[PDB]
Amino acid sequence: AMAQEIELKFIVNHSAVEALRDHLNTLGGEHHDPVQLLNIYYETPDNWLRGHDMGLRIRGENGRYEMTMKVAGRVTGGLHQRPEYNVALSEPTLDLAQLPTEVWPNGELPADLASRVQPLFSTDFYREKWLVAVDDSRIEIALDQGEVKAGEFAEPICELELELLSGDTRAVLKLANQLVSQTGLRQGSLSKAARGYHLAQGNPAREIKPTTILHVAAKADVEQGLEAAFELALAQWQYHEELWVRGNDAAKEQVLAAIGLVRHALMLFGGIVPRKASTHLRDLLTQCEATIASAVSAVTAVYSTETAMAKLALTEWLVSKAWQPFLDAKAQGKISDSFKRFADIHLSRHAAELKSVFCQPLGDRYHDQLPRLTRDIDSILLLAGYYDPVVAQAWLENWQGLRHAIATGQRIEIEHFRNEANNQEPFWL
Ligand SMILES: [Mg+2]
Ligand SMILES: [Mg+2]
């Protein structure tokens, strides 16, 4: 089969590198001085490997070569969990026959793959390492500094990785908790390969991604729905934070919206997961929101300890499934039942709230209802996924139009969408 890589990635603010290196040196690990890693990644003209979330490189460490294939896995905040397979090489030339068949989607290497792959991008960086023990786990800390480059287009590498060599993922999260007491770290959801692929397309500006309806598997239980909901909210926070720190000022609003979605998900599942399961998480989210609101700089806001601690708290809560020990028998029964059936009930609950609030025109008092309206839209986004996507998104579009118009003060559009929303019927059972 494949091996399994588990590592937590933090992007490091450039000014914080020296202070980080000093801190890492107080942990009492086995330290290795920087070594240059030279990598070339390979890809076809039709972006075949990228289409499968899989990356192929040859790594050089002082004339010693290694071929590595990573395949589709999971990214949760900064935590990358990818299957991989590494093969030692005698010289820098690919040998695709050495990889197991389970690497390939069809169980067979495409006939022309070796012939049509070209060098698409490189990563050239110096890696400094600390090996540390946390409980019964062993973790390799890597500090990477250099470049990722696709022809003309390059961007800096300045990041920290905590790779689990053996043991438990909880140990990685424990280690992270010590490090985010100081500024200069943010969880990074983009692999070096993902950034390399983007540069190779001419490094176009990334666009804001509005949240769309969550689609959870048929037969999923409520717990699976909950996991998918929090995965989505964290992914939307990560994506928009990356855009914001890269210079998109409009993305700030979407960072706050994603944090709002976390809160609304906690409320949605609050009949099952008690409020006390998320006391500390919600406290940290409040301080993060305040820091974001008052920030003069995206860089300062994003690399702050308020943001760092709040984000790590959410990642840990999700990955550790921290709700589980709080569930009594009744709650366990409800969380193990159908998400589809749960969703039908809660769609009606949120529709009742929307109808009662917006059945009449509200004059100068629309803006005070924004939090309620936003909660209900967010809740329906998480719940509406078992129906026809065209019908369901069309239903939501009218409430979303109302929310936009209220937020920007468009009097005509407020009344238009309020009427459209009150004239449409429900789509659910
Ligand atoms: Mg890595
Ligand atoms: Mg690694």
Author numbering: 0 to 428
Paper text:
Members of the ancient triphosphate tunnel metalloenzyme family can be found in all kingdoms of life. Our comparative analysis defines that most of these enzymes share a common catalytic mechanism in their tunnel centers, yet they have evolved different substrate recognition modes on their tunnel entries. The observed substrate plasticity apparently allows TTM proteins to act on a wide array of enzyme substrates and to perform very different reactions, many of which likely remain to be discovered.
To assess the functional relevance of the observed metal co-factors in AtTTM3, we studied substrate binding and metal ion coordination in the evolutionary distant TTM ygiF from E. coli. YgiF shares ∼18% sequence identity with AtTTM3 and has the same catalytic activity and substrate specificity. We next solved structures of ygiF in complex with PPPi and in the presence of either MgCl2 or MnCl2. The ygiF triphosphate substrate is bound in the same conformation as observed in AtTTM3, and we could identify two metal co-factors. Taken together, our experiments define two consistent Mg2+/Mn2+ coordination centers in plant and bacterial TTM tripolyphosphatases.
